[PDB]
């Protein structure tokens, strides 16, 4: 279990950094346009 | 950890109610 949870935590951490970066450039890539 | 979870849960509840409000405003003047 703990191995599974921490696998999911880590992949969520990666997906979160990805979503956050995407959100950022998406916002700038508009305001400027 | 207990105090920290209770605080994040409460910040999320806040953020949920705001997310719900916002989705209504989006839905509001989109139906216009």
């Amino acid at each position: 279990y703990t191995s599974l949870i921490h696998s999911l935590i880590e992949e969520s951490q990666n997906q979160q950094e990805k979503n956050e970066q995407e959100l950022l450039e998406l916002d700038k890539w508009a305001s400027l346009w | 950890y207990t105090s920290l979870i209770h605080s994040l849960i409460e910040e999320s509840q806040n953020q949920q109610e705001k997310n719900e409000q916002e989705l209504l405003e989006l839905d509001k003047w989109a139906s216009l």
Partner: peptide, 29 residues
Amino acid sequence: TVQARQLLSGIVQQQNNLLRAIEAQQHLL
């Protein structure tokens, strides 16, 4: 397409806190 950004941001920001809550709960477990 402006009020969608405010929503997207609030979703991503609340997913960060769900994920944090889970992280912290994992230390309780």
